[PDB]
Each structure stands twice: as structure tokens, then as C-alpha cells.
């Protein structure tokens, strides 16, 4: 057999999947993840896949550090993953504009509160739920004709911006955790225009 290698955590909005190599020839894998202070819990058993969904484990506590290991068996050798702390490390997903509306000489732009895989009882917690005041949004607004790169920032889910009369603007939003070291920013939302 070959030991697994290049173990990576693929994660967005807490949806979390460990990946590795190689594509197995005459062998199988079993993944074990560790609470770090309990034990080695397997989540995948004797699979021919080179990935394991670990969402259900990390969403139990997203402010924990997780280790994983991948055992190799013939159709024994193992390898330790890098450390993964979900809260600090998981990628923010692409946001969606909920609504824009022309309130007087200003425009209101609302971002959807994105749902995550973190679960508490019977609620699937949202970005806002998990991150709270650590979460900020950025907006970009312009009419694609003269292209005026004007920026707005909000602590909530709503922007209140100044606009020119009769002018059709285009909008795109971004999710931002200023506090982070890595993956501070989501990808941009689909553009919405008047």
C-alpha cells in the first residue's frame, strides 16, 4: 500500500471535507478525526474515495481545533492532516443580495443572512448567528456607464447609500471578517441592477 499524503481541508461556511492522495489502487482508506482531547474518531470506513465529509463533526463545535489521520489498508500506514480551526479558517460563501429599494434620495441594499451547516437543536445557524459582530459586509455600487468605484461598509446586513437621480446603479456585496488572518473575504455576490 501507499500512505495517504497532501492532506488538505476543503471548507466553506463550515461545510468541511478532508482531501488527499493518491487515487487508490488495490487499497482502501479510513479517516479518523480527533477532538484533540478525547480520541480518534473515524468518520469514513474503508472507502475508495480520496475525500471525507466531516461537516457533522466540526459543526458540533466550530471553535475547536481538529486533527485528522488517514489509514491505508489493502483490498498499517497512516498520515496526520494539518490542524484545522473552522471558525478562523473556513472560507465565507458567496453572498446573495436580498433586496434593493430606493428610499428617497438614498438606496437601501439588504444582504441575505446566509445559512450554514452549524446546527443547534433544530436550527441551522446563519453567518450572523455564528460570527455575530465579527461579520461585516462590503458593497460596490455604480452605473456601469461612467463606472464610479464607490465603497460602502456595514456592520449589519443593510446598506444606506447616496445616489444620483434617475441613474440606474449596479450592486455587488462581499462578506468580510476583518479580524481574520486568512480568508478574510468571501467571493463577490451576483450583481443586481435597477
Amino acid at each position: 500500500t501507499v500512505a495517504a499524503y497532501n492532506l488538505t481541508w476543503k471548507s466553506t461556511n463550515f461545510k468541511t471535507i478532508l482531501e488527499w492522495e493518491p487515487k487508490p489502487v488495490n487499497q482502501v482508506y479510513t479517516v479518523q478525526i480527533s477532538t484533540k482531547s478525547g480520541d480518534w474518531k473515524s468518520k469514513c470506513f474503508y472507502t475508495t474515495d480520496t475525500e471525507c465529509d466531516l461537516t457533522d463533526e466540526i459543526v458540533k463545535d466550530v471553535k475547536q481545533t481538529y486533527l485528522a489521520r488517514v489509514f491505508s489498508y489493502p483490498a498499517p500506514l497512516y498520515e496526520n492532516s494539518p490542524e484545522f480551526t473552522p471558525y478562523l479558517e473556513t472560507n465565507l460563501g458567496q453572498p446573495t443580495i436580498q433586496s434593493f429599494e430606493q428610499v428617497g434620495t438614498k438606496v437601501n441594499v439588504t444582504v441575505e443572512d446566509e445559512r450554514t451547516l452549524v446546527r443547534r437543536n433544530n436550527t441551522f445557524l446563519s453567518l450572523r448567528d455564528v460570527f455575530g459582530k465579527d461579520l461585516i459586509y462590503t458593497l460596490y455600487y455604480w452605473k456601469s456607464s461612467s463606472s464610479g468605484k464607490k465603497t460602502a461598509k456595514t456592520n449589519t446586513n443593510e446598506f444606506l447609500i447616496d445616489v444620483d437621480k434617475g441613474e440606474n446603479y449596479c450592486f455587488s456585496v462581499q462578506a468580510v471578517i476583518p479580524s481574520r488572518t486568512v480568508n478574510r473575504k468571501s467571493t463577490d455576490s451576483p450583481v443586481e441592477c435597477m
Partner: antibody
Framework: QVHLQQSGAELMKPGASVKISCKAS????????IEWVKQRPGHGLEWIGD????????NYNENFKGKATFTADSSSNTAYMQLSSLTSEDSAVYYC?????????????WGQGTLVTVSA | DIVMTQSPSSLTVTAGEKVTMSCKSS????????????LTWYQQIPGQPPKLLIY???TRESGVPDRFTGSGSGTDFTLTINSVQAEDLAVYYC?????????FGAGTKLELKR
């Protein structure tokens, strides 16, 4: 259990500084904010700001800038606040607490405090 | 700054009664995005630092008994210690838990008559 450990009680003279340590056991050090809180005898509670270990981010209460210094050594499980130019409005009890597990869930755990006493 | 004024400033009651105190942010802790009142509650008894009571105005923290009850929306709130225990003896503070700066109440001095 989670345990915030604040450094022992201190006396300093109305001039130079004082380093206070919050040593946190019982969880993952880097993923929760630590909080600094002044409490005076009969004054309610006062929020100096916060800091996230592992990314070193900080937010100060504007009335203090000039006074407070938040730091934490990731790799020794301890957060730090230094206070300069000590005075009487500095003499108080100082508090370290952990952020919320569920996002905006207040302060959850608190350090036992430390009395700052400022006189010659 | 979101200022918080608590009231009554103090209050003194007998064991067993029901108590109510009000908390009022200078403007709204209502995140219309997901309908949450971003207010928080502390109990501070003699000889110990703040105990966290309730988050999101009306979510009871693990352990904390069901006889305390948070309520209100936006800029008007209410801890109601229903059927006061003697051990409930504290000063309670609500705390803005929404936007920076992080702020506090004046505090509410609960004392016990007997």
C-alpha cells in the same frame, strides 16, 4: 471546564506601567476573544476592549486609547494588558473574560480579577 | 455610543416575590436581518465577577434556572426574576452585545427583605 487565570494582585506608583496576564486553559485559545473590563467599587462595569489571539485583532474603548495595550502570546496560552501613566481613575479591579460560543452570546467565562492600586 | 440605562436603579424585595427591571439601549439592538435582539444579561453576586445570565435578550444560558426570564425588543427589555430565590441576590447588568463599542448598563441592585 474552561479556566481563565488572571495574574496576582498588584501595587504600582503613579507613573510607569503594569503587565497583566490572562492565562486560559480549558478550550482553544485562538478562536475566542478575550475581554478587558475595569470595575470600580460601586460604578458598574467598564469595557476597555477586546483581542483575538491567533490573529491579534483588537478593539479599544475610545476613552482609553493612550492607556490600554492588548496582546496575547498564542503559544503560551496567555493574554496581556498593560496600562500606562497610572493614576487614581486607573486604580481598580481588572477583568479578563472569554467571548461567546454562539456568536453574540455575551461574555461567558470571567477571570477572577486583579486589584490595581495606584499610589506612591 | 449605544448607552444603556437600567431602572430601577436598585430595588429591594422579599424572598418569594416576583421582580422586574428594565433595560433601554439608546438605539435598537434589533438585527432585522434575522430578527434578533442583541442584548445580554449579567448577574453579579458578592465575591464574584459577572455571571452571564442570558444572550439574545431571551436565550437562557446553560445551567441558569428557568425562573429568570428575558424579554423585549429593540430598545426596551426586561429581566423578570419570577418567584425570587434568596440566592438570586446580585447586581444585574445588561450589556450591549451588538455593535462596537461594547457598552454597559448602570446596574440593578437587588437586595432582599426578610
Amino acid at each position: 471546564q474552561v479556566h481563565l487565570q488572571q495574574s496576582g494582585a498588584e501595587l504600582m506608583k503613579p507613573g510607569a506601567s503594569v503587565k497583566i496576564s490572562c492565562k486560559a486553559s480549558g478550550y482553544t485559545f485562538i478562536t475566542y476573544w478575550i475581554e478587558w473590563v475595569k470595575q470600580r467599587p460601586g460604578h458598574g462595569l467598564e469595557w476597555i476592549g477586546d483581542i483575538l489571539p491567533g490573529s491579534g485583532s483588537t478593539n479599544y474603548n475610545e476613552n482609553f486609547k493612550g492607556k490600554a495595550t492588548f496582546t496575547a502570546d498564542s503559544s503560551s496560552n496567555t493574554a496581556y494588558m498593560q496600562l500606562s501613566s497610572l493614576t487614581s481613575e486607573d486604580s481598580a479591579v481588572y477583568y479578563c473574560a472569554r467571548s461567546g460560543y454562539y456568536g453574540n452570546s455575551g461574555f461567558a467565562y470571567w477571570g477572577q480579577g486583579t486589584l490595581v492600586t495606584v499610589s506612591a | 455610543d449605544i448607552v444603556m440605562t437600567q431602572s430601577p436603579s436598585s430595588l429591594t424585595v422579599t424572598a418569594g416575590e416576583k421582580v422586574t427591571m428594565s433595560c433601554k439601549s439608546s438605539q435598537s439592538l434589533l438585527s432585522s436581518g434575522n430578527q434578533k435582539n442583541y442584548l445580554t444579561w449579567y448577574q453579579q453576586i458578592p465575591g464574584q465577577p459577572p455571571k452571564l445570565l442570558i444572550y439574545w435578550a431571551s436565550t437562557r444560558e446553560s445551567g441558569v434556572p428557568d425562573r429568570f426570564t428575558g424579554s423585549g425588543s429593540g430598545t426596551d427589555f426586561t429581566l423578570t426574576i419570577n418567584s425570587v430565590q434568596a440566592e438570586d441576590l446580585a447586581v444585574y447588568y445588561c450589556q450591549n452585545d451588538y455593535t462596537y463599542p461594547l457598552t454597559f448598563g448602570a446596574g440593578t441592585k437587588l437586595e432582599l427583605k426578610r
